[PDB]
Amino acid sequence: SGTIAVKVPASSLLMTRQETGETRLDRSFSNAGLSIGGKKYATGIGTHATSMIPLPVPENPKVLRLEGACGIDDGADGDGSVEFRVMSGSEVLWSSGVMRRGMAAKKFSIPVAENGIRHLYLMADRVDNNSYDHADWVDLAWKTTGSGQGMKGAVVNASEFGMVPGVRKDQGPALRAAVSALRRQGGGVLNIPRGIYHFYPEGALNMSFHISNHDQPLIHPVCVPLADLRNVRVEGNGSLFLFHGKVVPLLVMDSENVSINRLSVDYERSWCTEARVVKTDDRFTEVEIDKKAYPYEIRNNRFVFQGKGWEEGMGSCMAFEKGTGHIIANTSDIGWNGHVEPLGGSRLRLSWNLRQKGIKPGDTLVLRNYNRPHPGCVVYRARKTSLNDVSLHQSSGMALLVQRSEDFHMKGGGVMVRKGTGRVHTAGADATHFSNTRGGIVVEKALFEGMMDDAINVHSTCLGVMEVVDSHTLKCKYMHRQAVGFEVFLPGEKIRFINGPTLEPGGTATVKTAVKKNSAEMVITVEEPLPSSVRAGDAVENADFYPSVVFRNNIVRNNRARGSLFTTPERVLVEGNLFDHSSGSAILLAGDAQGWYESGACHEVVIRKNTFINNLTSRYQFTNAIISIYPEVKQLDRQRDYYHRNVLIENNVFKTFDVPLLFAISTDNLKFINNKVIYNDEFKGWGQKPFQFRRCANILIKDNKVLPPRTWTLEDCKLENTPSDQVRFGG
Ligand SMILES: OC[C@H]1O[C@H](O)[C@H](O)[C@@H](O)[C@H]1O
Ligand SMILES: [Ca+2]
Ligand SMILES: [Ca+2]
Ligand code: NA
Ligand code: NA
Ligand code: NA
């Protein structure tokens, strides 16, 4: 009794990861009538393994249970094999076992209200391969009731669920049981008694979803899933969580007001491998590797790096100077994957001339490649997430990835080397990263050192317009292979058009419908007729997902590429930080519709009270000055509107060798005032002008103090398509 049909929202299809093709409602994968075991079904979801469908639970009416059935669709041309799972945010609630074509649909009835569940995940796992895995969910119904008791919070101590520190056994299942218990009491406190705890893939919650700016493995094994939670404070009590294998350590997803306090995350076997340089000459480099810390084999005289259940090849190294921990000047990525000769005694001879690149005995090579399958901490469809004194020491990708979320606060902690590991490296990519977010971002009082990329990157994802189908319909593509599939437009959200050739944001529109055709292609229908200037070759970005940014009182040091990247029109405040030997530029304002397809014009940027010490000793993409403003504009001569606007650089201290201070393209209202610049000769000078401007306007350079003393004039600026009258000075 008491069931109503589930109406699956169109937004749930856009949030679904599905391994092949399109997810359909009330039709099979093959776009025919749903049919399982010879029996027809009028309504359901036609998906294909592997897939995972997030299904929100209505607040009204009050839901007691989800009922339905599942099985292989008869439209499959062969005998597929799928395991269906109904999941909460922390546990598998029901599994079908392996289902095959011809088997009758298997029914389920899942408790919702008594588990405190407001989001379910409907997963179809491919089992072996996904050939013929046409997977149906059918007869989906909510069992509903008149009233439900409001839950009044609880304190859940993870030790009461079997979590024990100091043993190399998987503590994942215990912790996930504790999370489930806290959810069904309405949130509160999750207490973790102080200790070192181990986590492995075998007991993680296997989920399938897309993570922006990462590789796209089909399965993320989530060890600490803080998903579908409201009003939860996780008390780490200074614990250390150690991870093994390829996993997502932490996930905050479909949650509100979740905070994590006083917790550290590391891997015993890093994603990267350190080698100490022992000897060099023009043909060879001899190194030593601690094989216990970094297991490896030499296979056909090539490195094979090894962790639990994984092997990775070598692609390149980052080279770190002995004693200082700086990235060696004028190196950047050193690409190599050559002859390795074992010498015994943990010593290896590499067929590699590193001497010529400045490497010396005592230096450290961080051996790595560009693979980034899983971030350390993922925040996804979460509102008001906080990390307080959270240290993310290592990750197989970015340490912290936040996407499609609103309001995020990180205070203290950071991405730094754990004492006693002897490492110089931390994250396998960015420290923190914010892709299509909104509300306020605040990252403060943190230490970010040794990452294989920037300390922060805030941007939108812009899609390419592939075709205008009619006056209301666009075919759009996710253009970069590491930013596909996750939702970027939902019904009701606003679209901003971008003229492709000139990188000029244009008009706006409202999404009426959006259909994901596969992981890289969507069809968007807008409410009103498209502006006539919108054509194939333009781009689109979401006008509802721009965050404000406060990046303050942090230390950023000894990291690959740039210190920080910002592309958002809301206020950006970069204040009180120390950028200490960031390898590349300290700050980059980028934006493009041709390469990374990351966009978001800055309209209000304050960079004040920072200290910049000998940044930009090695060059990377776009690193033309300590502060570089480098949107990519294919036809700059034809551009009318300036991309970036109102950038204020004041009251900073630059301790720098002879390298440009400020490079900017397509920027209007750009002030470099009341800064202190102290020049040294510790690194080789570039011999270029300190200010370089390409199609800029309303530049003011005034009241700076420079040592050794000089007076800056127009002759200290390189001007390209920038009339000299647009550059003003002042005593
Ligand atoms: O330049 C943009 C680029 O910056 C860093 O390298 C990030 O790791 C990438 O994912 C991408 O955002
Ligand atoms: Ca299969
Ligand atoms: Ca156009
Ligand atoms: Na496919
Ligand atoms: Na309790
Ligand atoms: Na012009």
List every span in the chain annotated with CATH 2.160.20: 166-269+375-451
Least Cα distance to 629 among 657, 601, 608, 651 occurs for 601
Q: How far apart are CA 681 and CA 473, in angstroms?
A: 58
Query: Residue 578 and residue 567: Cα distance in Å, rounded?
Result: 21
Interatomic CA distance for residues 619 and 60, integer angstroms: 56
Structure determination technique employed: X-ray
Contacts with 725 (C-beta within 8 Å, 6 or more apart), sequence order: none
Cα–Cα distance for residue pair 119/117, rounded to 1 Å: 6
**CATH assignment, 3-145:** 2.60.120.1060
- Distance (angstroms) between ligand 2 centre and the Cα of 82 equals 5
Q: How many helices (H) and strands (E) does the chain have?
A: 2, 64
Token pair listed for 645: 């606007």
Task: State which ligand 1 atom lies nearest to the alpha carbon of 398.
Answer: 8
Q: Token pair of 185, please?
A: 């009491």
H-assigned helices in 219-264: none
What dihedral angle (degrees, nearest 10) is formed by the CA atoms of 482, 484, 485, 490? 130
d(CA 27, CA 261): 46
Q: Using the atom order of ligand 1, give the atom closest to the CA of residue 483.
A: 10
Element spanning 13, H or E: helix 10-14
How many CB atoms sit inside 10 A of residue 4's CB? Answer: 12
Q: How many other C-beta atoms lie within 10 A of the C-beta of residue 3?
A: 16
713 is written with which tokens?
């004039």
Q: Read off φ and ψ for residue 296, nearest 5 degrees.
A: -160, 165
Portions of the chain given CATH number 2.40.30: 462-542
**Cα–Cα distance measured from residue 379 to residue 187, given in angstroms and rounded to the nearest whole number:** 18
3-state SS string over 306-320? Answer: EECCEEEECCEEEEE
CA of 565 to the centre of ligand 6 (A): 27
* CATH 2.60.120.1060 residue spans of the chain: 3-145
Tokens (6 digits) for 138: 């059918």
Q: Please enumerate in sequence order all residues whose Cβ is within 8 A of that of 55, keeping only pairs 6 or more positions apart, or say none.
A: 6, 8, 12, 66, 119, 120, 121, 122
Half-sphere exposure of 648 (CA within 13 A, CB side): 14
Number of the ligand closest to the Cα of 78 = 2
Residues 493/525, Cβ–Cβ less than 8 Å: no
Smallest-distance ligand from the CA of 29: 4
Report the C-alpha dihedral over residues 482, 56, 247, 182, rounded to 10 degrees: 150
Tell how far the Cα of 695 is from the centroid of ligand 6, in angstroms. Answer: 8
Q: Are strands 62-72 and 134-145 parallel, antiparallel or unpaired?
A: antiparallel
Query: Among candidates 277, 350, 347, 370, which has minimal Cα distance to 319?
Result: 277
Closest Cα to atom 10 of ligand 1 = 213
Distance CA 18, CA 32 (A): 18
Pocket of ligand 1 (CB under 6 A): 213, 429-430, 453-454, 457, 561, 590, 596, 598
Pocket perturbation via mutation, ligand 1, pick of 216, 486, 565 by most ligand atoms within 8 A of CB: 565
| Cβ density class 370-403: b for 16+ within 10 Å, e for less | ebbbbbbbbbbbbbbbbbbbbbbbbbbbbbbbbb
Q: Which residues, chain by chain, have CB under 5 Å from ion ligand 3?
A: 499, 533, 538
Gyration radius from the chain CA atoms: 27
Residues 6+ apart with CB under 8 A from 415: 391, 392, 393, 399, 400, 426, 427, 431, 432, 446, 447, 448, 449, 450, 451, 455
- Distance between CA atoms of 130 and 598, rounded to whole angstroms? 32
Output the residue whose Cα is nearest ligand 1's atom 5. Answer: 453
Resolution in A: 1.7
Nearest to 625 by CA among 570, 672, 668, 576: 672
Do 431 and 456 contact (CB within 8 A), yes or no? yes
Ligand 1 centroid to Cα of residue 565, in Å, is 9
Q: Please report which helix (H) or strand (E) contains residue 12, including its range.
A: helix 10-14
Cα-to-centroid distance, 19 and ligand 4 (Å): 7
Residue 637 Cα to ligand 6 midpoint, Å, equals 6
Mutate which of 370, 460, 585, 598 to test ligand 1's pocket (most atoms within 8 Å of Cβ)?
Answer: 598
Distance of CA 617 to the CA centre of its chain: 26
C-beta separation of 487 from 15 below 8 A: yes
| CB burial string 314-329: b at 16+ within 10 A, e below | bebbbbbbeeebbbbb
Fold of 462-542: Elongation Factor Tu (Ef-tu); domain 3 (2.40.30)
Which ligand has its closest atom nearest to the C-alpha of 720?
6
Written as one letter, the residue type at 29 is F
Whole-number Å distance between alpha carbons of 645 and 648? 9
Contact 73, 44 (CB under 8 A): no
First-to-last C-alpha distance (Å) of the chain: 82
Q: How far apart are CA 644 and CA 663, in angstroms?
A: 13
Q: In whole angstroms, what separates CA 392 from the centre of its chain?
A: 14
Question: Whose alpha carbon is nearest atom 2 of ligand 1?
Answer: 596
Provide DSSP, 276-331. Answer: EEEEE-SS-EEEE--TTTS-EEEETTEEEEEETTEEEE--EEEEE-TTT-PBPTT-
Which among 666, 662, 589 is positioned nearest to 635, based on CA atoms? Answer: 666
Interatomic CA distance for residues 160 and 705, integer angstroms: 62
Going 169 to 173 to 177 to 178, the CA torsion angle's sign is positive
Ligand lying closest to the C-alpha of residue 500 = 3
Name the token pair of 375. Answer: 């971030």
Do 430 and 454 meet the contact criterion of CB atoms below 8 Å apart? yes
β-strand partners of 541: 496
Ligand nearest to C-alpha 635: 6
Say if residues 536 and 476 touch (Cβ distance below 8 Å).
no
| Dist. CA 257 → ligand 4 center (Å) | 37
Instruction: Please report the atom of ligand 1 found closest to the CA of residue 596.
Output: 2
CA nearest 450: which of 429, 436, 420?
Answer: 429
CB 106 within 8 A of CB 168: no
Q: Which residues contact 711 (CB under 8 A, 6 or more apart)?
A: none
- The CA 365 to ligand 1 mean position distance, Å, reads 22
How many Å apart are CA 397 and CA 482, to the nearest integer? 12
Alpha helices by DSSP H, listed for 171-242, are 172-184
The Cα–Cα gap between 346 and 275 comes to 10
The atom of ligand 1 lying closest to the CA of 621 is 1
The span from the CA of 65 to the CA of 59, in Å, is 13
- 166-269+375-451 CATH pick, 1.10.730, 2.160.20, 3.10.450, 2.30.30: 2.160.20
- 95 burial (CB, 10 Å; 0-12 / 13-18 / 19+) is middle
In 351-446, where do the E strands start and end?
Answer: 364-368, 377-392, 400-403, 406-411, 414-415, 432-435, 438-444
| Cα 598 to ligand 1 centre (Å) | 9
